[model samples]
Target chain A: GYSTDENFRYLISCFRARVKMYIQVEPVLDYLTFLPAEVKEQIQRTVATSGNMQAVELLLSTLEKGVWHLGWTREFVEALRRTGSPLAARYMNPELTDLPSPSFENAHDEYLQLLNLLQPTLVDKLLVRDVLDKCMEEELLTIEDRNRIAAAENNGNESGVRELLKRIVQKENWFSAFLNVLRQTGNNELVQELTGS
Target chain B: GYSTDENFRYLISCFRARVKMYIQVEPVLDYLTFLPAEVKEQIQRTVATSGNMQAVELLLSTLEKGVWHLGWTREFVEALRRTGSPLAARYMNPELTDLPSPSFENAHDEYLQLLNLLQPTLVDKLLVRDVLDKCMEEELLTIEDRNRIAAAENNGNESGVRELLKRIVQKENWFSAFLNVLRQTGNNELVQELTGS
Candidate 1:
């Protein structure tokens, strides 16, 4: 019911041509909870015994092999975004596969830009204490990032807020999570401001 | 010179005779920190893919395969005991391998006997507070056992102490860890009572 060849070919080219494939192997594997457990373990085994090239080759082959695998192709692209491969998503997402110019990459870029544009206001006005714990609870902030921000928060409001903004943007899809945290903490106007709602 | 061949033969016979080999695969694997990691993983892989019978066959083959292996033979029997195969050790332990039975199984049997004989005295004299947390911290008490003891302790002193004794005896080699907790908590006579040292 869906086109898979173009998606599969483009994914293969992205993996083949990019030196980024080396770094992406493990990170992308981490997000593939959608893959079968045995297949995941086999890919991991390949990663350990064979190295990056073979692991990803195993990953790409298992991804769309043996059936109409459009669902897997779609999820793999999402995993790519989660692992910070927006370039791959930008190329593969059919609706935004562009008039070859528009972007599946848009939401992430806008969110990142939103954070940047609101940085000074966010630094001064955002109730970090409210969102900080929530971001952590939602796992948007890793323990290291949580610790990193604590260093900045210890200095002053400006330092802490800037540090918080820095780490939150480092997390992909962290936008709605940060918004949810603010909403729960009763920062409704700030949510409207951030989301342009 | 350590006679590895006899030790190796006795252990093989033990695995061959005991259907207990089925249950021991995972539990014994837990204590095999002495084996090489790759061999351990392969044994585990064998266990998962090939049933317990073949897994132990692979395990025994690996134990004595190359050169003089007295060390692995000795460690594996210790693992057997740790995994509750005291019958295997009763025969394999050279010093206690017996003109056929003075017992390498003696220490564990004695500990169990001691617990049985001293149950009433232990229930009364032992301060449940001091050692309960210590037993747990040493990991002698699994969370379920901890929760189990807490259940009895909530009922009364006799209930709690009896439950602790029962659970501790269930853990192989828990005697010294129990003794150490007493010594730390300043129960000198109780420590002496348990160890006779």
Candidate 2:
């Protein structure tokens, strides 16, 4: 007979261990345009109001549709650096955007690619479960809501999943709130990938 | 406005590049009991027929349900090490199971924990896209199937996703075959995590 179910379960345990030690997710840089909404807005507004038309034009070029080419954003950032305009350059400091074109592109690509590879493992549902579990464990869920949620899960109901998630996401933006929970777990690398903060 | 639709499209280019470099997958291991059917059968047959009932009894105890506790599997492997039963011990040799346990468990748990954190990103759909894109790029899909899959996706029809995946998975076992494609992209870590080889 095959290793008892007991053994197979433990095997999964060992497999989990390998994933943690060997797998690593790294930070990726996209043009400031791809930066999270808050950061991108802050920098764009700073440039727009700074009265640096040259820098403004450069930034605008990166934003232009279909006409821009690869490395154009990097070049624009570098040009902003040369102009000594701290307005947008502060956001594009060498520490963050120093990598050359294609290099930066490659890193960003790998981030998305690896993220894709891990998707099938149902880590997303597991995350939702973790949050819901914690809410109940911490007494965040109302007694009725918690019991109903549990019942819904037992009945294979999507409504419960949605209802609980709505409660969580409605409190603030779901995306940012979820990332905060991820950060709370000390998983900073994951937060950086999604938010670039 | 931000870079026209043109700029965001290129943003995907950089996303692809980063993924190639930063995301790494690794190998996972469990007791030899967890090896796939063919390998497990051969190894078990060799151990069972050997004249060492004492060792056989120890192995069987691990297989028994309801009584064995967590980490007992690790202990049995260690016990087999000390007994020096070349018959069964050879199967448990360090080369076959070089890494230590509790250490493995902690890492695996961390991996699962972090992976769960990334669940909200919809990376699963991204994976489906990657495979479909590859199928077309490599000409693995026919014109009819490719067009249908695309239109199915446009309409948010899951049957289309399944239909397309069925074509791909039909040719080979899903997990191993998918990992093989990931490996070809120079991502051996992913291969190890899924296969434990």
Candidate 3:
């Protein structure tokens, strides 16, 4: 799905006053690996002085203000989606047209919801990397996506799947593409749970 | 000369405004190996938000207020002394009493100054480890000190010597003791540079 820069920045600013203290900021910070060591150190100091509740908002503010460029909104959303909070990503930039919004007046696939429900299980059990090559061949993921996922996977398998699932739902036809990749990669058990077929 | 807690805090607080931006914070952070991962992350976040000019100050403040104990003043100074800046350390806690104060109203041994002058050369060429076993045998360094030096050496020889030198200066008779250790270990060139003998 496509999103404008205004919507992204507007939504990010909206959350500036609110706080969620429990969010694990480490993984999110880890995803922004391109931040210079000194720049990251200031973020650490903020965490020390004010608490990690401000981390995401601060990152967004700095990113948009050109304090530290994080590519475009797509990359920012991808980073957020790749790490701790994907719902926030989709909320600001919904692309899955087949899916119903919160104001669902029509029937929707609800696969994304179901995917969220199964996230912990999927994160733990899905052989995400094993399916990555197939997904790339299917054009469900790009080479850079595949490479970043590989780097995340190096942190561990569970992290790999977390990253993989995040990318899976971003595709225009990810539902079927992911299912096919799973079937070909011996993730039939997950497919069965996911599809009831 | 031993330092009081008040003097240490007083000296540290004095520099809260005056900053040395070029002081590399990474080695200091690395030396703080016992800090909780999240606590260190807070410091990193601070560096990102405020610039590393405040990092060392923030570290000292939190370390003193019981927000995170750095094992009282000696250990805090030791940590500073071990990495990045050492003159700041001696200024705050001048243990080598034989060395003249900045006022220089009296004759002084001045070996500490000579040691500082030869620090880079000593750090590079002195077989600090080969002398470590004998230093410990001579009761110049304790078992815990030996263990910590080994840990620092594991990082690299330069780091090891840097740490070794910090400990050497803390001893009462370190002047003769350090020279004797180097002489026995065939660091005669360093001994000559240090003593002019």
Highest lDDT against the true fold, candidate:
1
Clashes of each: 0, 29, 20
lDDT (10s digit) by residue, model 2, range A1-197: 33333332343333322212111111011234354456445434433332122123223322432343454445545443333222233234323443235554345334433433333322334344445655644333444445656665663444345435423321212344455665665445566655556
Q: Which predicted model would earn the best TM-score?
A: 3
Q: Is candidate 2 or candidate 3 better by lDDT?
A: 3
Every model's DockQ: 0.03, 0.03, 0.12
Candidate 3, residues A54-101, lDDT tens digits: the string is 765566566557544534566555556654344345544534342235
Give a tens-digit lDDT track for model 3, residues B1-197.
24466555665565443223223344567666657787788887655568555675566666555444444556655665665355345544524443235543111136655655556567657655587888876666655557767775653465467567655654445678777888888788988888787
| Cα lDDT tens digits for candidate 2, B32-81 | 33334343333344333542233333334334423434454454444434
* C-alpha RMSD over true interface residues, each candidate: 20.1, 19.4, 13.0
Chain B TM-score, candidates in order: 0.49, 0.27, 0.49
The C-alpha local distance difference test score for the whole of candidate 2 amounts to: 0.37
Q: Is the docking of candidate 2 incorrect, acceptable, medium or high quality?
A: incorrect
**All candidates in order of lDDT, best leading:** 1, 3, 2
